[PDB]
Symmetry: D2
Subunit: 481 residues, 4 copies
């Protein structure tokens, strides 16, 4: 067995270690070829046809690059080729648990289809990685290349999902704590996963990337913080670090939370919900599963990809008529109409408990205008969007450690006061989008009146087009003055 | 509610779409209407490079986005010709018609694009003659009638029965002296924009060069925007034709060189081709058992779906996964081939060779070549005997788009001093470093037996075959078959 | 006379109208080939060898692109090919007044060499444009292409420098107000000049551009605001507008105000000051000028470019020995040492009046530590840097007008409350950098103690490396806790 | 103050530099020390493409940044060969030596790079033989001695008198059977990295392809990182040499095709060449009057500055502006030529042609060609008579880097199955679409009289000359000289 060279448009010519190849060339991994990275985003950005597969190769490659560089500069860290492999494997396998249309699946569909469960793609990756290992006889191949399967398998899973439960990790000790920061960084969100998707999503979307990951690597060291050896950034790179998160927020703002992309995700989810009772997926021992229950059997889940969208679209079964008809509305570009957007004021926070109650509120607003139609709760969609720097209210830079030129082994902290007064004052906010399922001109005009009135009643921000969409409603609120 | 010169101002707003290749593009509402149909959206589910994605992981792009690009570039080119030369009388109607043909040129592609009409249909239904271009005509007709497009066309100044006919001609060529009916000789240049049958210079290439490169990780060296700036329309015979600036002839040869490089590096990749072959095999073994419902509830096969546009609408890359995920025991053989692809247990590449001098392998004889390889008698002591059925012999025609011909012999040029005067430039006049010939054949051989002993044997059979046929010495000949190469001293 | 096609790496193949060619092909314009865009930046970023010339072609091209697009979409605006040309010419000629090393010249050198005068490159461009016109017989060529020289020349100058003095402009009336917003936008800083330099500087620097000017153009319209027809942006592009200014700030932060690039500018300026009495530049009627007085004669100024740096470096004249020796220190990379950086706290603002007094303050600090050397005022450089969004304390978006999808001819305003709580709270700040001209280890150690002590005394922010460079000084200040 | 295994940990910090082409690069302190000298910084003031900047406005890049890139790539290549093959015994000392040669290969370039040793010196001082490469040796020596580099070299494990000699050999080739002294035969591959005299495959090209393209606005199609991954060291004869993977032979031919394209589009641009010519003319007319102070206060001319490295250090593109800004009446003629450049009053291009068959124009005879053109007798009624001195005849040798030879005939390959075994691949074995020849000549003619009547006349003289000499028909022949082309029916 020898290495393969593979050409990636983002990273160029990459070397794949035979062990990685062996993992790659399985039904469980190849599955990621059939799941779009940005889900419904492709229906708004025609370049975004890329799949989780190629992203996963990139993460695996970057993970190895970062670990290798840290090792070359600091042999005292005792990074072995075994460690490198383990980090590469976790990089490759971090996304094994994604379902159809990626985040649509665990973000929208599963919570609606099966509210009793708690499911994340990351948990799925653990289960799928286990399934991949056992079904393909990977352990002996691991041993052949110097890995210790029981330790390292556990290590790999920890890197993907976090602690499986004081130093909470078992796969590696405190003096290799930095190995847990590479693929998925739970402490501050600085990891190679972002680095790949920034570059790859940008290449495909037609938006240019502004973050330089290679610079970051050159300015990265490992320093003692408490009893852990941790990744530290050069002090004067703090500005570039804030920009990294700004880039993340810009991508979510422009692309990942696109108002129409979100509506397409919603519509696809609706179709899936209406198909869920009637579609059968065969899993372990011939047992049958639904779209919503395929997550319980990794054999069935292996066969659950974006294909499901087309199985529904091409179906003839009269019981799939409702599902099929929603997908056809997507093809004819007869989508739910966007009504507007607003935000909470001050420190008001919309709780997820209450998301379900918001369409009723909008429908219950009493705009003092002449209308030709009355709209019901079910005619409205209210999509609440949490935009943040990856750690809710928190500033990630408060959880980053730095080093100075004069003392490169000494970890320090940098506070927000010490950086720049032009930075954000807060690190989380909510965006509220409202849509209407009734698409004619009269319903849309009405929806707008209900919406702006709702905004006024709730003391939400004045919609940007408020004076134009609801001129009779906006004077009423002099806070909007 | 604003007025200018006493007339009301009407604001028409176009849809803007962001393409990574072309940037922000404006789509005319008529184009949008055509785009937003099941017949056009279908192209979202057919990969541009087919099996190429299984070798180049960036190549996940679909025919859909390529089609938007062709449509956009077609409009860009026509518009530019018009701005520079009003005397050509290019109308906004002409522009639209060329854009539409650009959008719709690929409507007829099937699963994995060229795999389908290039490999599968010829094997599954040898009696028929099918091309994706014909499919595009049928599919365009089906798109038009099923979505009530004609009145929308009329609304924007088009004359449907003229223009529909025009659009089809642009896509497939003449439908039966000046052979075209959609437009006359003095708009001959409109037929050169989307699909150029005379010399292969068209916007379709311009899009795929750039788009394929962006996705593949190979950099594009052709500059289409430069070409447009150096393009004019000049009288050639009695036709008004697109002419290139004389000193751009070097760049023109390079355009075709880029095309050949892309075929060489990517489109004809030895492993990409084997994956296409394997997928085709799976399809052939599934063709009796898969049902696709078309017009009036009629059932069709993968191979017969091309006869009904309603069924064909539902025939995309999905078929690969339908086969892969199937449980039906009758699909077991098909399914098993696709599983071998997933486990990367592929047919092994044995080697490559070419014919010598000007010998040409006739397509008639392709089928007889595996028997020849198996019938070779290599003087090597072997552990296995291989049969005809163990070998695949893939003959590849590499050329400049016009068989033996030099496309530049069919290009017309203009000079700075007389920009309305068309001239010819011969190969003698340009550069002695250019190719002497414009077509060749590459012969690849593979073995379906994948173990080490069979592969070693296959190599001996292969190189022996090459020696017997007076083919070129394989590049790795002395290493893969050291006992076989000395016999042939032409190979010294 | 025919058009030329020119290939620019940024904009691709561009068409140049013969009138533009005629202006381009003069000593006054070709001069810009010998003045680096980023001045001393090239000595930090080796890709930044680009000159004002190519930037000027780009601005001229983009100016035409923007005006043409506005015209195609809105014929009611009555944009003529004459207007297009006038805007292209102003774009080409906006930078004619730059001196050696661009902003170094009017930003550093002239204020030190001739404090009594008030000089800006923009004024220089006006003078140089006039000189270009008269010396090359451009007026009849202008007339040949439908321009009216007395009107249009005046128009062009207004576009470059602003009002030459209620509607304050004479070259065009209120209903073409939008033509003044294209090359140099004094109202809100949204103009094609930025658009070119973002892209061009990025291409050369090795930093990726994140702003999409072509998108902006597609979402731009002209709408009535007061009595003026003004450029308006689509409402939902407000997020992208804030990002435009963020990109500007990032470029200044990373590149244009690089701590070492600024020191090289300083050193070059010092050399120029020490050479200014001895270098002769021949101007109009054979009269002699200095580097500092060449700005008074456009004929002499025409011959004043980056060449001056090499004339000094290659000189043998003993009177240039001091000047020459500073440039040699640059070549040997014996530069002034960076000591650290800090900022003012709260709403404190350092006035430019006081900049000169700051080195004395630093030298007068009394750090309670053992030192081997005493440093004087003249050993310190204190570089105060104003970082802002282009309009001092102001938010440029408060001076932008928008339009909505439903009413594309209706101008509206969008306030900061209506956008995003993750945006900056303030739009200006100051950065204070300190350097030491004594380069040995003992002086640098001392300089650091003086500096951090100075920061403590002034209630400035704790330097990022404060605890490492001056561990004995930082505990003292518990505000830094 | 941290310890591991009981020994103190020492943190060495490298300088990081950001290059737009290569990204963030690490510079070893020894390299920094060499970089930060007047001799090296000088390269900041010499444009890579000389007069090319006056045609391609992006091409403002200087030799400095190119030199950093070559040095970086040289290290990248050596490092990669070493990682894959430890048996080669590549040391960090070897790495440094190759990096240094990479950095310093261009130290000898003069004003406007190739204009200087290619045009000016041969005209200004015909008795001498001068190349920039020789200059680099002299300048490297001067850099070393003037800046006390040897002890710094020793400090980092180098052996100065061996390694200095090695570095010079890498730059200029052999300094007087195995002809090299700096390293033995089993490190022969180290001589192939910076400047490859055997087949032209080296990192110098790799940098300039990418860097020139980035600046010019022409896109690069060669992938150097791919090449590195497919490169090995194999025994060829008794030398260890760099070998390419067999199936990369297609990409290798394309590498040289890219080189030829760049020369064709950019480096030999018909107007760029005329600007080089005009600048050279100015320099020639200034050469008697400009003084450059060198070692011990001695005075030198532009043409004699090459004899003293101290003077030469001060000879850069600055000379162009010194001439342009001068007031001395003795520089009036020189100054006036440069002013014509600024006003874009350039010598007019007349046309281009080539020799036929395998006729070769000898360099001896270049000087006699303008007389020939002026002596042609075109049967056209003209308003002016042109003289020899009114014509410029620029003969351009276009080739694959080794005159008539195919570089691929001098490349060694390895196969997948036997990666330590060097083999040869012949042209027959690869592709019949490749060039038949590897060298040719282009003849450009210009006229120093710029008015409309002289230019019309020049064209008649030129095409007539072409007919008389049996040269190829100019591409615009029938348009520029319609009365002249019929006479020659070989041109039909
Ligand atoms: C041939 C070729 C492949 N590629 C891509 C496709 C793959 O992603 C990657 C490696 O492809 P190849 O080098 O073609 O890999 P292979 O496995 O076919 O070769 P072998 O087993 O004989 O060594 O490079 C290029 O980018 N350029 C090229 O010229
Ligand atoms: C919001 C946004 C979209 N896009 C892409 C997605 C699409 O391909 C294209 C158009 O996006 P939008 O301008 O968002 O189009 P829309 O139809 O959602 O807006 P509206 O109907 O309100 O006018 O641009 C960007 O490139 N950048 C951006 O910032
Ligand atoms: C600050 C900065 C510099 N650069 C470039 C400029 C240089 O070419 C290279 C190195 O810049 P710096 O890292 O700023 O180097 P420095 O020598 O100024 O810093 P120090 O001595 O404090 O370690 O990177 C960036 O590309 N991006 C950035 O954000
Ligand atoms: Mg392989
Ligand atoms: Mg829309
Ligand atoms: Mg010209
Ligand atoms: Mg530094």
């Amino acid at each position: 067995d020898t290495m393969k060279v593979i050409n990636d448009p983002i990273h160029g010519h990459i070397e794949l270690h035979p062990l990685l190849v062996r993992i790659i060339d399985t039904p469980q991994f190849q599955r990621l070829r059939y799941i779009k990275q940005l889900g419904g985003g492709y229906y708004v950005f025609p370049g975004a046809s890329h799949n989780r597969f190629e992203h996963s190769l990139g993460v695996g490659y970057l993970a190895g690059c970062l670990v290798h560089a840290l090792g070359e500069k600091q042999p005292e860290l005792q990074i072995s080729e075994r460690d490198v492999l383990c980090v590469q494997i976790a990089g490759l396998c971090h996304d094994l648990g994604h379902g159809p249309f990626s985040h649509m699946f665990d973000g929208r569909f599963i919570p609606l289809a099966r509210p009793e469960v708690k499911w994340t793609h990351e948990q799925g990756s653990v289960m799928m990685f286990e399934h991949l290992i056992n079904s393909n006889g990977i352990k002996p191949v691991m041993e052949q290349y110097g890995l210790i399967p029981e330790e390292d398998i556990y290590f790999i899973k920890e890197q993907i999902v976090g602690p499986l439960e004081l130093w909470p990790y078992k796969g590696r000790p405190e003096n290799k704590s930095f190995l847990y920061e590479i693929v998925s960084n739970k402490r501050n969100g600085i990891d190679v996963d972002k680095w790949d998707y920034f570059a790859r999503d940008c290449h495909h979307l037609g938006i240019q990337n502004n973050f330089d990951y290679k610079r970051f690597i050159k300015f990265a060291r490992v320093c003692e913080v408490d009893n852990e050896l941790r990744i530290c950034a050069r002090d004067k790179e703090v500005g570039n670090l804030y920009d990294m998160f700004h880039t993340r927020n810009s991508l979510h703002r422009r692309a990942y939370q696109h108002k129409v992309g979100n509506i397409i995700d919603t519509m696809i989810t609706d179709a899936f919900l209406k198909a869920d009772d009637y579609i059968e997926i065969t899993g372990a021992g011939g047992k049958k599963y639904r779209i919503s229950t395929a997550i319980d059997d990794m054999e069935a889940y292996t066969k659950l990809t974006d294909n499901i969208f087309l199985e529904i679209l091409y179906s003839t079964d009269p019981k799939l008529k409702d599902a099929r008809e929603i997908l056809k509305q997507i093809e004819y570009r007869n989508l739910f109409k966007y009504v507007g957007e607003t935000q909470p004021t001050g420190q008001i926070k919309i709780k997820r408990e209450d998301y379900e109650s918001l369409p009723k509120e909008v429908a219950s607003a009493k705009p003092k205008v002449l209308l030709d139609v009355k709209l019901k709760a079910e005619d409205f969609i209210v999509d609440v969007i949490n935009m943040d720097y990856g750690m809710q209210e928190k500033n990630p830079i408060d959880h980053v450690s730095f080093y100075c030129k004069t003392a490169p082994n000494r970890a320090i902290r940098i506070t927000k006061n010490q950086v720049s007064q032009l930075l954000p004052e807060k690190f989380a906010e909510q965006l509220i989008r409202v849509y209407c399922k009734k698409v004619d001109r009269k319903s849309l005009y009405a929806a707008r009146q209900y919406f702006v009135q709702w905004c006024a009643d709730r003391n939400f921000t004045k919609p940007q087009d408020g004076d134009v969409i609801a001129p009779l409603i906006t004077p009423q609120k002099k806070e909007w003055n």
